[PDB]
Design a protein around this motif. Sequence first.
Motif, PDB file in Angstrom:
ATOM      1  N   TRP A  91      70.765 -47.516 -33.767  1.00  0.00           N
ATOM      2  CA  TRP A  91      70.689 -46.184 -34.359  1.00  0.00           C
ATOM      3  C   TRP A  91      69.722 -45.299 -33.601  1.00  0.00           C
ATOM      4  O   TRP A  91      70.054 -44.161 -33.306  1.00  0.00           O
ATOM      5  CB  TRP A  91      70.269 -46.287 -35.818  1.00  0.00           C
ATOM      6  CG  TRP A  91      71.134 -47.141 -36.666  1.00  0.00           C
ATOM      7  CD1 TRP A  91      72.447 -47.376 -36.488  1.00  0.00           C
ATOM      8  CD2 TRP A  91      70.759 -47.840 -37.879  1.00  0.00           C
ATOM      9  NE1 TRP A  91      72.915 -48.180 -37.498  1.00  0.00           N
ATOM     10  CE2 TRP A  91      71.911 -48.515 -38.371  1.00  0.00           C
ATOM     11  CE3 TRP A  91      69.563 -47.964 -38.608  1.00  0.00           C
ATOM     12  CZ2 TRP A  91      71.872 -49.302 -39.522  1.00  0.00           C
ATOM     13  CZ3 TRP A  91      69.521 -48.743 -39.770  1.00  0.00           C
ATOM     14  CH2 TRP A  91      70.666 -49.414 -40.222  1.00  0.00           C
ATOM     15  N   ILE A  92      68.549 -45.812 -33.230  1.00  0.00           N
ATOM     16  CA  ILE A  92      67.574 -45.030 -32.469  1.00  0.00           C
ATOM     17  C   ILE A  92      68.153 -44.623 -31.119  1.00  0.00           C
ATOM     18  O   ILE A  92      68.000 -43.481 -30.703  1.00  0.00           O
ATOM     19  CB  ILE A  92      66.261 -45.813 -32.302  1.00  0.00           C
ATOM     20  CG1 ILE A  92      65.528 -45.893 -33.648  1.00  0.00           C
ATOM     21  CG2 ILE A  92      65.366 -45.161 -31.241  1.00  0.00           C
ATOM     22  CD1 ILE A  92      64.464 -46.977 -33.698  1.00  0.00           C
ATOM     23  N   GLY A  93      68.832 -45.536 -30.430  1.00  0.00           N
ATOM     24  CA  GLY A  93      69.435 -45.231 -29.142  1.00  0.00           C
ATOM     25  C   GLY A  93      70.522 -44.178 -29.250  1.00  0.00           C
ATOM     26  O   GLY A  93      70.551 -43.244 -28.456  1.00  0.00           O
ATOM     27  N   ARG A  94      71.400 -44.264 -30.251  1.00  0.00           N
ATOM     28  CA  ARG A  94      72.430 -43.242 -30.451  1.00  0.00           C
ATOM     29  C   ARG A  94      71.811 -41.891 -30.774  1.00  0.00           C
ATOM     30  O   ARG A  94      72.247 -40.872 -30.243  1.00  0.00           O
ATOM     31  CB  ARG A  94      73.398 -43.677 -31.556  1.00  0.00           C
ATOM     32  CG  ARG A  94      74.600 -42.733 -31.649  1.00  0.00           C
ATOM     33  CD  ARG A  94      75.572 -43.137 -32.747  1.00  0.00           C
ATOM     34  NE  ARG A  94      76.413 -44.279 -32.370  1.00  0.00           N
ATOM     35  CZ  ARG A  94      77.440 -44.708 -33.069  1.00  0.00           C
ATOM     36  NH1 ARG A  94      77.716 -44.172 -34.212  1.00  0.00           N
ATOM     37  NH2 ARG A  94      78.181 -45.683 -32.633  1.00  0.00           N
ATOM     38  N   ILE A  95      70.785 -41.858 -31.618  1.00  0.00           N
ATOM     39  CA  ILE A  95      70.111 -40.606 -31.957  1.00  0.00           C
ATOM     40  C   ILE A  95      69.482 -39.987 -30.715  1.00  0.00           C
ATOM     41  O   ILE A  95      69.601 -38.786 -30.495  1.00  0.00           O
ATOM     42  CB  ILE A  95      69.060 -40.834 -33.055  1.00  0.00           C
ATOM     43  CG1 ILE A  95      69.749 -41.141 -34.387  1.00  0.00           C
ATOM     44  CG2 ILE A  95      68.177 -39.595 -33.222  1.00  0.00           C
ATOM     45  CD1 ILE A  95      68.810 -41.821 -35.375  1.00  0.00           C
ATOM     46  N   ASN A  96      68.819 -40.782 -29.877  1.00  0.00           N
ATOM     47  CA  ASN A  96      68.211 -40.257 -28.660  1.00  0.00           C
ATOM     48  C   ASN A  96      69.261 -39.707 -27.699  1.00  0.00           C
ATOM     49  O   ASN A  96      69.094 -38.639 -27.128  1.00  0.00           O
ATOM     50  CB  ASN A  96      67.377 -41.349 -27.986  1.00  0.00           C
ATOM     51  CG  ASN A  96      66.469 -40.791 -26.913  1.00  0.00           C
ATOM     52  OD1 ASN A  96      65.949 -39.692 -27.022  1.00  0.00           O
ATOM     53  ND2 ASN A  96      66.241 -41.540 -25.863  1.00  0.00           N
ATOM     54  N   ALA A  97      70.373 -40.394 -27.529  1.00  0.00           N
ATOM     55  CA  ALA A  97      71.476 -40.003 -26.738  1.00  0.00           C
ATOM     56  C   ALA A  97      72.025 -38.670 -27.168  1.00  0.00           C
ATOM     57  O   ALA A  97      72.264 -37.759 -26.365  1.00  0.00           O
ATOM     58  CB  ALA A  97      72.488 -40.990 -26.594  1.00  0.00           C
TER      59      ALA A  97
ATOM     60  N   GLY B 237      70.497 -36.369 -29.059  1.00  0.00           N
ATOM     61  CA  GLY B 237      69.507 -35.422 -28.929  1.00  0.00           C
ATOM     62  C   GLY B 237      69.259 -34.878 -27.583  1.00  0.00           C
ATOM     63  O   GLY B 237      69.061 -33.676 -27.375  1.00  0.00           O
ATOM     64  N   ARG B 238      69.286 -35.699 -26.583  1.00  0.00           N
ATOM     65  CA  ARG B 238      69.093 -35.380 -25.221  1.00  0.00           C
ATOM     66  C   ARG B 238      70.070 -34.357 -24.703  1.00  0.00           C
ATOM     67  O   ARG B 238      69.813 -33.687 -23.697  1.00  0.00           O
ATOM     68  CB  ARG B 238      68.926 -36.546 -24.341  1.00  0.00           C
ATOM     69  CG  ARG B 238      67.711 -37.304 -24.251  1.00  0.00           C
ATOM     70  CD  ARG B 238      67.556 -38.407 -23.349  1.00  0.00           C
ATOM     71  NE  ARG B 238      66.313 -38.985 -23.178  1.00  0.00           N
ATOM     72  CZ  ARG B 238      65.283 -38.548 -22.527  1.00  0.00           C
ATOM     73  NH1 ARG B 238      65.389 -37.503 -21.899  1.00  0.00           N
ATOM     74  NH2 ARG B 238      64.211 -39.147 -22.520  1.00  0.00           N
TER      75      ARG B 238
END
Lengths: 113, 228, 47, 158, 61
Positions: free
Chosen positions: E52-58, E60-61
Amino acid sequence: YKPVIDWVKNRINARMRQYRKRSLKKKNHSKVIQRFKLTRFGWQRLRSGRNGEKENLTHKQLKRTMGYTFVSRDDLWKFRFQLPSHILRLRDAPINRNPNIRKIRRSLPSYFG
Amino acid sequence: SRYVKVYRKVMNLQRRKTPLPWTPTFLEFSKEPSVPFPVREKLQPAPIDLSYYLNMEVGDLVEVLHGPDCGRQGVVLSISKKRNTVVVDGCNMKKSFWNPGVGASLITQEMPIHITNVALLDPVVKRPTRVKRRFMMNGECVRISKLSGSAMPEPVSTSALRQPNLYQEYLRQKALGPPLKASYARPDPLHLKILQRLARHISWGQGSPLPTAENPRVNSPEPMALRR
Amino acid sequence: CNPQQTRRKQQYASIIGKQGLSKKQCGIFWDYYKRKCKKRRSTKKFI
Amino acid sequence: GTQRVVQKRRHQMRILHPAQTAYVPVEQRPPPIPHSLTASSTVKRLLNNNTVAAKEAAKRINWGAYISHQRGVRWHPQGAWRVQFSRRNHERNFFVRCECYFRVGTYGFQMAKDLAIRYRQRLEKEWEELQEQWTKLDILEAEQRAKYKEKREEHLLL
Amino acid sequence: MQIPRDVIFEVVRGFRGRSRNCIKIARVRAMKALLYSYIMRRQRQRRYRVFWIGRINAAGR
RNA sequence: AACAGGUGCCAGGCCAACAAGAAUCCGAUCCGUGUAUUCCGUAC
RNA sequence: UGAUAUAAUUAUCGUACAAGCACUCAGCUAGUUAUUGAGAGACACUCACGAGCCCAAAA
RNA sequence: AUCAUUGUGUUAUGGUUCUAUCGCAAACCAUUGAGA
RNA sequence: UUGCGUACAUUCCUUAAUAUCUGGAACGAUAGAUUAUGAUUAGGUAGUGGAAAAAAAAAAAAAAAAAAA
RNA sequence: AGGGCAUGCAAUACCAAUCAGAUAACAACUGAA
RNA sequence: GGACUCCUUAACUUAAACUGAGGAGUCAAGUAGGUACAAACCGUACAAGGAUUAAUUAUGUCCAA
RNA sequence: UGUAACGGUACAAGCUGUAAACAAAGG
RNA sequence: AUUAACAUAACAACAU
RNA sequence: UGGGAGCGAAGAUAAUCUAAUAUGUAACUCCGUUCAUGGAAAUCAAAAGAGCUUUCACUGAUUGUAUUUAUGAAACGUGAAAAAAAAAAAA
RNA sequence: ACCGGUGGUUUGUUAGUAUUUAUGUCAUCAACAUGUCAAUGAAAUAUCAAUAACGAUGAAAA
RNA sequence: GAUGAUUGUAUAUUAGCGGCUAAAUGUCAAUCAAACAUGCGAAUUUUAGGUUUUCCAUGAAAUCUAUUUGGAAGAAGAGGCUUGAAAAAA
RNA sequence: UUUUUUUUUU
RNA sequence: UUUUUUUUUU
C-alpha cells in the motif's frame, strides 16, 4: 503337540499367594527403639559424649551433656518407617488470617462481612 | 517354615463341601460365595462296575489278600457298585461306638473293603481263581471256576445273613439330642387330655368364652361370607 | 490397541440402533444384539 | 496394637490453649461492614499492619458511609455502586442478569447511591408485573386448548 | 499424539506418493504444513502495508 | 433368568406318547420365533 | 510466475549434527495390587457416631 | 483453481487373519423299590 | 533547517482460572444462561496440581408429554 | 453277558535277609536313602 | 559440583573455546525482528485465539529492498 | 489297567482281533 | 468370506 | 502333594567381605495322606489352680535370637469348634 | 437311616479343552506347521433344458 | 615320507571338582583358560534402551556439609514454592 | 479384643 | 416391657 497349562497348580499357588498377602503385620526396629523415649511432648534421647572423656569441660557443659534433648524435626521422617507402631502427631500453632479476630477490629464500629 | 499354615488352609478347601447350610438372622449376610470352589479335572476314564464283570454275588466265599487280614476267609454281606466296595464278615473291624442297646458299653462294626482287595476261592483247590458264566441249551446258567473247572455252589440265603445295624441306630439316636430327663419322661395323660381340650377351644374358638357351670354354652363357628 | 477396534465399534453402532435384524445380517454381533433385545423387552413384564 | 500420642505445649506451668470467647446476647444486631472494602489496598495494609498509626487512622476513617440499607445495592472497589438482579425462567425462556454500575466520578457519592436504589426498586416492580401478565397468558392458552379439543371431537361426531 | 489421526489424512490430501497414505510420513509432513501457515498468518500484515505504501508513493510521484 | 432341545434366525401355548391361540394388525423383495394388542394353562 | 521456510526422537552446557534405531503396513507389548499403611511446615478426598468408637473366628 | 505431460481426485477389481463343539460328577436335593 | 519507512493494542469479536484472599461473607435457588468501559491474567523444560473425554459390559425404571396418526 | 479274542511290554513275589540273570554252596565281600 | 558475554582478578607464552574465583543479563526453559549464512549480542507495551488498522526502535533512507 | 506292531474293513485320526460288524427259533 | 501396506485398470481436467 | 524320614550346595541380601537370612530351600531315595498323624502326665503353674491329643482367633510382630542386612504361627492365659478310658476270667 | 433305579441343581450362562503326525539332534532334548468330518444354499428328495439367443428352480448364480 | 616313532580296519576303555596330551592352553560332536541338555535352584546390574489421549493452573537446579570425593547431578540431609497486592468524586 | 479418656472447673 | 419358635392324628 500342544502346550497344556497346569490350572490346578496355578490356582493352588495363586490362592496361597493371596492368603499370605492379605495376612501381613507391622514391623519395628529393635536397636532404634532401644535408644528412644516417647512422651506426650515428643521424642526424647540422650546426648553424645556421656561415656566419653569429660575432663576439659566446665560445669555448665557437663550439666547439659548429662541431660536430655528432644529429637530434631528433620529426623522424624525416619520413624515413619522405622517405628510404624509408634506415631507422634505434630501440633503446630493455629494459622487464621481472619481480620475479624485481629486487635484492629476492636477500634472499628462493626465487623467485616 | 512360614508357609505350612497357609498351605494347610488352602488344602482344606479341597475337602470342604462348599456351599454349606447357613440360617439367616437380623441384619446378617452370608459368606459362602467368598469361599473358592475346589479344583477338579473333567476328562478322565468313565467308571465301571467291577462287580458285574467279576461275577461276584452276595454270599459268596472270599479271602482277604492284603492288609491286616493277610489270610482270612469270609462271606460277602453287602456290595456297593458305585463305590466298587464289598463288606465281608469278620474282617476289617475299626468302627467303634457306644452301645445303643442291651449289652456291653462299646460295640464295633465291620467296614467296607475294595473289591480289588479280595478274590473268589476255588471250590476244591481253595485258592484264588476266576469264575465264568456258561449257558446251556435250555437256558440254564452255570458258574464254572478256572482252576478246577467245577461248578460253583449256590449263595447263602438272605434270611441267614440278615443282621441288625446298630451303627445306624446310634446315629439316629444322636441326631435327636441328649437323653430326656426322668421327671419329664414320666407320662401324664390325665392332664394332657385337659390341655388338649383347652387347645381346641383356644384355637377354633374365635375368641368365644369357655363354658361355665351356670352357662354351659359356646358360640357356634361363623362361615366365610361371599362378596356379594 | 489399534485401528481395528474403531472399525468394529463404528460397525456395531450402526446396527445396534435398529429392530428386526436377522442372524445373517448381524454377523459377529448376533449374541450382543440378542442380549440387547432381551434386555429391552424386560420393561413390558408385569406381575 | 498401635499408640497415637498427640503433642502438647508448655508455658508457665500451664497448658497453652487457643483463644476463645464467650457469648454476649444482643437485642438488635447492627449491619456489618461490606466485604468489598477489603478488596482495596488502603484498608488491606491497614489490616495487615498492627501498629499505632493504623489503629489511629482506623478511628478517623468513617465506616458508616459505605453501608447500604437496600438489598441488591453494594459497594465496589472500582469506586462505584453495583446493582445486582438475577432471575431465571425456563418455562417462558427468559433470563435476566443486571450488572449496572453507578460511578462516583460522574455523579457523586450520594447521588449514585440514590440512583442505584431507585433502579433496583424499579426492577422489582417490573418483574412483578411481568409475572402477573404470564399468569393470564397461561390461562388463555389453556382456554384455547380446550376449544381446540372440542372442535376436534366435533369432526369425529360428524 | 499432537494431532488427531483423522485429520492428518485430510490435511495430507493431494500430496505426492507415500505421503498421502503413510501415517509415519504424513505426520511429519502435516506438522510442517500447519506450522508454516501458523507462522505466516501473523506476518501477512506488514507485507500488505508495504505494498500500500509503495502504490501510494507511486501515485503521488 | 421359560438356554430344555428342534423347527430356516430370539417360542409357556408347535414337534417332542400328560395342561394351554393354525389368535388379530403391521412386513420390499422373503419365509419370517420380529413390533402393537389380547386370551389362556400352571403344585411344570 | 512472486514472496517465504534447516524431516522427527532421546541424551547433552550446547538448534549439540554427518552420533544411536527405523523401507512400509497388520497383530501383541512396558506403573499391577492395601482383610497388612498413611498426613509428618514441597502441598492429601469424603461419610457416620461421639467421650466415646470397632468387633475377631465359630454363626 | 498450474492437470501444461510422467500429477492428483473418485470409483472398481485383486490381495487379505479364518471361531460350525463329538462334552458336561465323584458334590447337593427330591422321589421311588425290598428288607430291619 | 522542515521529513519519512519500522516489531509488539486483551480499541473490535469468541474462550479459560481448584494448594483456603479477585469483588463473591454478593445475587439467585427445583439442583446456576457465560458479569455489556471489571481489576490481575493466560511463553515454558524438570517436578507438582485441576478438569473434560475413551462408541463396550452389568443393573429386574425404554411410554403420566404438544400436534398428527 | 450267548460265542470267539494270534503276537509284544524280559514276571516262581496272592510272598520274604541284601548284593548279577532264567534271582547266586560258606568264605573272600565292602553299604547314609 | 554450567555454556557465552560485561567489570575485577589467580595461572599460562599478559598466549588458547582451556583451569579456577567475586556480582549483573541472556540461553538453558524464548517465538517472530536486526546483525549476510547455526542457542549466548540489541530491542520488545515479548507467542490464549481470529481479521486486508494506527504507533519513534535496534536501525535505515542510489539499485537488488 | 494304559499303550505299540501285524491282519480285515472302503488301507482309515473310526471300527475290529482269522468266528476279523452279530447268536435272537432248544418244546 | 476377510482391514491396511502393496499390484493393475476406468473416468474426471484447458487462462493454455 | 510346600505332608513325614536320610543327605543336602550355589546365584541373591548385607550396595565388596565373615557370621546370619535365603533354607534345612533346590536335585536324589523312601512312606502314600482323617480307616492318617498324634496321644490319656514322674507335665505345667506357685502358693490360686488347670487336667490326653488336634484346628481357628486374640493376646502379639509382645518376649527372645541378632545388627552392618533379619527372623520370629515363642511360653502362660482368654474365646470358639469338636469331645473318647480301656469292650476285658472263661464257657 | 445303608443299598438299587429315576429326575433336577451347583460346579459352569461369569471358566475352559488335551488324545492322531510332517520337520531338528548321535543322544539327552526342543516344538501351538498346514481353515472345517464340509462346494454353496434353510432345503440338492430344487444342480432342469441346450447350439448361439430367449428359457427352468431358488431371496440371491453363468 | 615311502623297510619304518610305515599306513589301514571290526568290536572296545578313560567323562568336566574330569580325561587325553613325543607339552601347543593343542583336543573331547566344526570359536572350551574349563564342553553340551534341563531347572517353580522361577538371575544380578549405581552402565544403558523403551515407556502409549488432550486441555488448563503453577513453576527449578547444576549451590552447601558429609561419603579416604569421584563423574556422565549416585545415595542421605539442608536450601529453593502460592507472600502480596495494583481499581476513587468537593 | 484394640484405641482414646480435659490438667481447665464458682 | 417395647418380643419370639403349629401341631394335633406313621
